[PDB]
Design a protein around this ligand. Sequence first.
Ligand SMILES: CCCCCCN(CC[C@H](N)C(=O)O)C[C@H]1O[C@@H](n2cnc3c(N)ncnc32)[C@H](O)[C@@H]1O
Length: 246
Amino acid sequence: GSSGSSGHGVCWIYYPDGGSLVGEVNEDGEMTGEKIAYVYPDERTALYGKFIDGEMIEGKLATLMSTEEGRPHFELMPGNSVYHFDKSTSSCISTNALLPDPYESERVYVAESLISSAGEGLFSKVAVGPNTVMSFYNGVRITHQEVDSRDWALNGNTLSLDEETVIDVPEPYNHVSKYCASLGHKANHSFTPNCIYDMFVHPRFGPIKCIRTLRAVEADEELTVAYGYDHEAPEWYQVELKAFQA
Ligand SMILES: CCCCCCN(CC[C@H](N)C(=O)O)C[C@H]1O[C@@H](n2cnc3c(N)ncnc32)[C@H](O)[C@@H]1O
């Protein structure tokens, strides 16, 4: 009446790894909707689409073009590439083993390693700064007991994830033609690495490890990482180890 007259809120959840969830939350404050997005650590590559409580139901490849007062504008990338939360188990590595991670695909590729008799290695596509997430280490999730209690000829692709879980990429998935959803396992070992394994929360893969650079790397530099066995360990390692003090 006798008073002057006149005539919604976006939320960002950042992970320690630099990735993030973004959208409007529902009445209960959960990331639920069809306009929710996950944003890779480059803060431009995105998976936009349907999410229930932060879990990706249907993420379409997208680019974060700009942000205005916390409100992100997304723009769909060309194609039919869609992604969903697809956490592996102890026997299922992926529901779409041949569906590449789009972020990884821009940064790494697999070629023959420069380290002799190392096999294949992982290489960069891009000159980047230190601390750049480059690649993802996904695989099946088996316990420390199963791993530790079997031969070393089975553990060439095992990477401890935490106190409870080891990640493995077992036969035939060590072949790029059978599994290329993630490529972290293609990085060979150096006692003078340019990367580390690091924690990562992936919208498709769940909690896993990634390869993150320790420093600047050139386009086409081989990406290496210290495997970190205890001082037991495979022969080539034990051999490379002793052949390093010099
Ligand atoms: C705990 C870390 C888990 C990820 C390791 C996976 N692979 C690397 C990928 C392998 N080049 C391949 O083409 O599937 C390691 C295998 O590659 C060779 N390799 C890795 N680094 C090497 C080095 N510095 N020297 C010789 N051989 C090496 C050995 O045959 C390993 O079993």
